[PDB]
Each structure stands twice: as structure tokens, then as C-alpha cells.
């Protein structure tokens, strides 16, 4: 193989040890070259972790550490810190394609993050938004752990089946996940029922909010 | 110290192209070559070429099919990265780094931050924000009360939003930006702590969009 090979995806517990492994082919591990790693954590650019199979540019701690075998590689990383998580590349160079190559990357999971059940605001269209001739309903789904979420809405106590646009949830700069769901109705649509519901779904429970356009008046 | 700077962010339409530079500082710049290496969203980091910061030389990935141009200039310290006729595949965060020499190899010991690239035909807009509410604006009945800003029909990503009570910045809830059909985006932001009563004008929520060299603040939330 012309390319480099990392898992998707380890985890571990804080305190503890993950290694990431990295193989290559005839070309590039096996035509003699060292690999290197890369450190990307969110939002940054890549930093330079490990050079030359396992040195360590200056300031790098100790617990971050590289091995490399003729077939295979390994970047350690022992005492995991919550700071540690983010993605991990491994690196060569590939005489086939005469070319710099990357791994698809491996993204680090920190575990003992508690689970968090999710803060759930719904909110009315604005009047502003209605005399531009809009409607949208809004659903903010805030800290919760971990990322799955699943969104219903209901017009009065019927389920709604269409209009509906939910983000993927991601986390935010607190560690925890957020995620909106946005209802798209006509200023009809709006008024004509008694009331709408945005129904949020997180680890065995779930939590409605409601919201007439009747109250506030 | 060694350092990079790129440039900032572009938007490109098909079939045009695009120049991002990168300027070095703390070390001798004739004596490190530079490389450009990009990331797509979903793929991965991507090797994209080589420039001799001293002769000019350049080695470029065969991916490209020659639509790349390196060039430095040495007076200024400066390399640039030329992609002419881009396409949805271009749209990407592009690189900049430093190619250090070791006893038995190189590696790229020193990365600029990154210039976002965005390869779109819909045209650049200014977000639209409306103040949202929960709670009627003047409650009765002793439910709290939340603030939110929506902010709806821009592109390209992202907007910055930020959050006062007077003039002191207030902590916020930030969630994913969503794209809808029309390709624009759509995004909210929440006041973090719940209100009970506030004078009108009290706290406000600022949007900016660098894209649009433009910044929009909602300071006054009506009765309903
Ligand atoms: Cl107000």
C-alpha cells in the first residue's frame, strides 16, 4: 500500500495508556523511511508530537512516545489527560508516489466524562421574524454527555412531518455536546394550533417543552 | 521564536482561483524549505507541495494535474500558494509548514495557523439575526426568562457571536451551524443565565461575519 493505515477512533480513561498504531507498504515503511507524528487538537493547527520514529521535539512531555517496527508503528500516550483529546496523524514518505503521506488520522477519546442530561429551551417565533412572513420554532439542546440525541416535534399531539432540520450534535468549548432543531412553519401553520412540543431524547429519558401561541398575551 | 502567518479566509467561485501566503519570522527564511499541505472536510491532511525558499525550486503533488503554483518571496519572507481552477474538492483549511532537516530525515517541525478556502457560487450575505425569547419578555407569572439570537440566511461559515449586559461580556451557549437547501446557514446562540426583569436595551447579542466585513447587534427585545 501507497498510504498509511491508523484506526478510526481509541479511547481511554484518565490516568491510563492508549497506543495508536500506524502501518504502511513496500513503498514508504518499507522503502526505509522514519515516520512521524502530529497532534491536532480542536480547533488548531497540527503540532509536530514525534519526529524520526520516536524523538520528541523540545517541550513535548515524556508520556507521549513513538515506536516503529519494520511493518508497523505506535504512538503511546500514558497518564491521559481530559487536554489530550483530539486527532493524531501519522506521517512518511512514499517513493511510489514520490510524495508526502498522511494517516487517515486517529481520534482520541478521554473517558470519565459523566453522563449529563440535556438543558432543553424552546423558543416562539419572533415578531419580527412573523412580519417578515417566516415562522420558526427553535429547540436549543445544551450540555449534555454523550452525543446521541434524537428530536421529535408535535403540532398540538400530532406528530409533525415535515419542516424539520436537526444539527448533528458536537461539542462545544465546555466538553459537552450541543445540538438545535429548527421547525420551519408558515405564520398560518403557526397560528392555527393550540400549541407545538419539541421532544428530546438522551440516555433512557426524555424531556418536552411547550410553547401556544396564545400565552404572552 | 519560529513562526508562520497565513492569510485569512477566501470564498472562490468555480473555475476561479486563489492565492493564501505565509509569512515567516524568527529564523533565517533561505534556510528551511516550506510546504503546503490542506485538509478537506472529511479527509484527510494532504501533502499539496514544496518550495526551495532559497533557489525557488518546487516539487508538486501529481494530484493536482498542475494547478498549483508555489512561489517566495525572499525579501519578504513570504511563500504563496496559487490553485487555479478550483472545484468543490479545493474547499479545505490550507497549510502552511517548515521542512526541518534531521540527522536521518525531515519533518514538518513548525505549521502555520491555516487559510479556510471555500469553493461556492452562492454569493456572500450578511446573516440576518432576530431576538428570540422564552418566557413573553415581561413574565407574570415567575417563569424564567431566556434570551437567544437567531441568526439565519448567510454564507459562508461561520459567524462569531458575543453576548453583553452593558459592557461586560456575558457567558453564552454556542451550538453547531446547520446548511439548509438554499445552501445558506443557520445558527443560534443562547444567554447563558436566565433573566427575571431588565431594562430595555440592557443586553445585547453581537454577529459578526468576517465574510461580509460585517457586525450586527440586537439590543431590544419587543413584546410579543
Ligand atoms: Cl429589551
Known amino acids: 500500500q501507497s498510504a498509511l493505515t491508523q484506526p478510526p477512533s481509541v479511547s481511554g480513561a484518565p490516568g491510563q495508556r492508549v497506543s495508536i498504531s500506524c502501518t504502511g507498504g513496500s513503498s514508504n515503511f518499507g522503502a526505509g523511511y522514519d515516520v512521524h507524528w502530529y497532534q491536532q487538537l480542536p480547533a488548531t493547527a497540527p503540532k509536530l508530537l514525534i519526529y524520526?520514529?520516536?524523538n520528541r521535539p523540545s517541550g513535548v512531555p515524556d508520556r507521549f512516545s513513538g515506536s516503529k517496527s519494520g511493518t508497523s508503528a505506535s504512538l503511546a500516550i500514558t497518564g491521559l489527560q481530559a487536554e489530550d483529546e483530539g486527532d493524531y496523524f501519522c506521517?512518511?514518505?512514499?517513493?511510489?508516489?514520490?510524495?508526502?503521506?498522511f494517516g487517515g488520522g486517529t481520534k482520541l477519546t478521554v473517558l470519565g466524562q459523566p453522563k449529563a442530561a440535556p438543558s432543553v429551551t424552546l423558543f416562539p417565533p419572533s415578531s419580527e421574524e412573523l412580519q417578515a412572513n417566516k415562522a420558526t420554532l427553535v429547540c436549543l439542546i445544551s450540555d449534555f454527555y454523550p452525543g446521541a440525541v434524537t428530536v421529535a416535534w408535535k403540532a398540538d399531539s400530532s406528530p409533525v412531518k415535515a419542516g424539520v432540520e436537526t444539527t448533528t450534535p458536537s461539542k462545544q468549548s465546555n466538553n459537552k455536546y450541543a445540538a438545535s432543531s429548527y421547525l420551519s412553519l408558515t405564520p398560518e401553520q403557526w397560528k392555527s394550533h393550540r400549541s407545538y412540543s419539541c421532544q428530546v431524547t438522551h440516555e433512557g429519558s426524555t424531556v418536552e417543552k411547550t410553547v401556544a401561541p396564545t400565552e404572552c398575551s | 521564536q519560529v513562526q508562520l502567518v497565513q492569510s485569512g479566509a477566501e470564498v472562490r467561485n468555480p473555475g476561479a482561483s486563489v492565492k493564501v501566503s505565509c509569512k515567516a519570522s524568527?529564523?533565517?527564511?533561505?534556510?528551511?524549505?516550506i510546504h503546503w499541505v490542506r485538509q478537506a472536510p472529511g479527509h484527510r491532511l494532504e501533502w499539496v507541495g514544496r518550495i526551495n525558499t532559497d533557489n525557488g525550486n518546487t516539487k508538486y503533488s501529481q494530484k493536482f494535474h498542475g494547478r498549483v503554483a508555489l512561489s517566495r518571496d525572499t525579501s519578504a519572507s513570504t511563500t504563496y500558494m496559487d490553485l487555479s481552477s478550483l472545484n468543490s474538492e479545493d474547499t479545505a483549511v490550507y497549510y502552511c509548514?517548515?521542512?526541518?532537516?534531521?540527522?536521518?530525515?525531515?519533518?514538518?517541525?513548525?505549521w502555520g495557523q491555516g487559510a479556510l478556502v471555500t469553493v461556492s457560487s452562492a454569493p456572500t450575505k450578511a446573516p440576518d439575526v432576530f431576538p428570540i425569547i422564552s418566557g413573553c419578555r415581561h413574565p407574570k407569572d415567575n417563569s424564567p426568562v431566556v434570551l437567544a439570537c437567531l441568526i439565519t440566511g448567510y454564507h459562508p461559515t461561520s459567524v462569531t457571536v458575543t453576548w453583553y449586559m452593558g459592557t461586560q461580556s456575558q457567558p453564552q451557549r454556542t451550538f453547531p451551524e446547520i446548511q439548509r437547501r438554499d445552501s445558506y446557514y443557520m445558527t443560534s446562540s443562547q444567554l447563558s443565565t436566565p433573566l427575571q426583569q431588565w431594562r430595555q436595551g440592557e443586553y445585547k447579542c453581537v454577529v459578526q461575519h468576517t465574510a461580509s466585513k460585517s457586525k450586527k447587534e440586537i439590543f431590544r427585545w419587543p413584546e410579543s
Open positions: 506521517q512518511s514518505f512514499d517513493t511510489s508516489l514520490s510524495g508526502w503521506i
Open positions: 524568527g529564523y533565517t527564511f533561505t534556510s528551511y524549505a
Open positions: 509548514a517548515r521542512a526541518f532537516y534531521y540527522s536521518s530525515g525531515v519533518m514538518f517541525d513548525s
Open positions: 524520526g520514529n520516536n
